[PDB]
Amino acid sequence: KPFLSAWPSAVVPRGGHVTLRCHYRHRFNNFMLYKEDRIHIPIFHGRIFQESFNMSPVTTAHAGNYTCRGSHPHSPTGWSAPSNPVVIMVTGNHRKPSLLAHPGPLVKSGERVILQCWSDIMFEHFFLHKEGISKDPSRLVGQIHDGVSKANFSIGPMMLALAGTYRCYGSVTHTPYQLSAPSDPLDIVVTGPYEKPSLSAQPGPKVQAGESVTLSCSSRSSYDMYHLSREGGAHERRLPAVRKVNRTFQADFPLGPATHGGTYRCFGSFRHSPYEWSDPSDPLLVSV
Amino acid sequence: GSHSMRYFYTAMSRPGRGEPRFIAVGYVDDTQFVRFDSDAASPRMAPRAPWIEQEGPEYWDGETRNMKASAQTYRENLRIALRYYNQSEAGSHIIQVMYGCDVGPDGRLLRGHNQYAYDGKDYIALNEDLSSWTAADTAAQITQRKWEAARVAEQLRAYLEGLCVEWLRRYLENGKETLQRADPPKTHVTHHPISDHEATLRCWALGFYPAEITLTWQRDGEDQTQDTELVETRPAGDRTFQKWAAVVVPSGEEQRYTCHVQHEGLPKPLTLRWE
């Protein structure tokens, strides 16, 4: 049986593009396509795709459950057994749901996290999808509570393969292959076991005025980058690590003139690996 | 001897041809004893030698979980490698890993090994001290910084000193009558004319284990190491091996040629001749 695949992704937005490929006998030629309902009625009036089938721009009509049959000349039928099934899900068809992480988006290596998807719309199903090429979404049935529909996706035990940007989607009863617009993205970062850096303030953590405060992240481990995070509010900030004379790798985060302090932590990370951070530094309370 | 255990992993991407695939095989000396292949409908670690088959369900279940986790890890490593080398997601790439331990006659650790490759070239390797790395290029230097930051070498050292040795000893016991009993080669010489003035003498060794063997041709006691055709040692398919050595000799001078066979299953080296 052939290998059917979607490129770059089976989860694809309206207006986007996706290509179905049917690999059979070391070849991408000569195949027909079937949807799950009419599993012996070849679509497009029995069209024989000479090359890979390019759906572009993608419409809601492209959504569905596909199998392919490759050309097989000398056989009871001129075609192969059915390939593996590929579900093309088309997004952007309903208002987006909301996605949040419990207890938070920074997940210690080996631990579990709950990604809760919810909406005021009565979605029959929720889909959780990590962004990336050739990724398979997870599906859960939508539970109902006081007029909101929701699902809890369990992610873990945490590892780098599970870290990345996640989006969740809803779908309604009669169009299961049509997904909502995506939720706002959620960056799920695995932390550790890379050793925690040290966070200090210069000239110190007590500042009023008028006065400049700079927060230094430092480690003897060779991090390429440091991430400074304040509890709540202020967004994540990042800077390249610089190796000092005493062989520490350090970054200096200047604050102010606004910043009303708060509790800070910093993380180390390496080049080309944005979703795996070190263990968090000890907290540092900055007071204005 | 003097034995070894090795695991060999191959993780391959093949966009449009299949899902990424992970195959693992385990060897004691020259004998494969386990396999795992992610393409199977329901992948499991499986026995590939009879002496491991009576190992309990706890063993197969544990090894199956470990292989599933490793497969996941290496699929992600293929993606990471794509980023490290700035390569397109359309291409097919391969990560290979070999690791394991060598032990002496007393069953004690002699040496540990853990080496990785990307697309058939050295990528990163654990040093003999089992506490530091050698990175072959800048990408691998990224990996090195991570592994040093995560104390990976300590965990691997713990494996190689502990479980690797203990289990190799156990397998050597389980399979003693095949793994620790050398099978000597059955040998013979054949003769094939080439021309009216030259002919080939071929010295055969068959059905021997382990694979290590030495076949030499001598002419009045002097090695013909320059004029000997030596075929690669090859598996017979029954967990024994085969090899031959050939030499072109002038016709009627065959009797001046001797084949010398060295193998651990032989008490003393053999010397054969044609008729």
Partner: peptide
């Protein structure tokens, strides 16, 4: 017995 130590690149 296979190594329980698998880390990412």
């Amino acid at each position: 017995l296979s190594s329980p130590v698998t880390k990412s690149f």
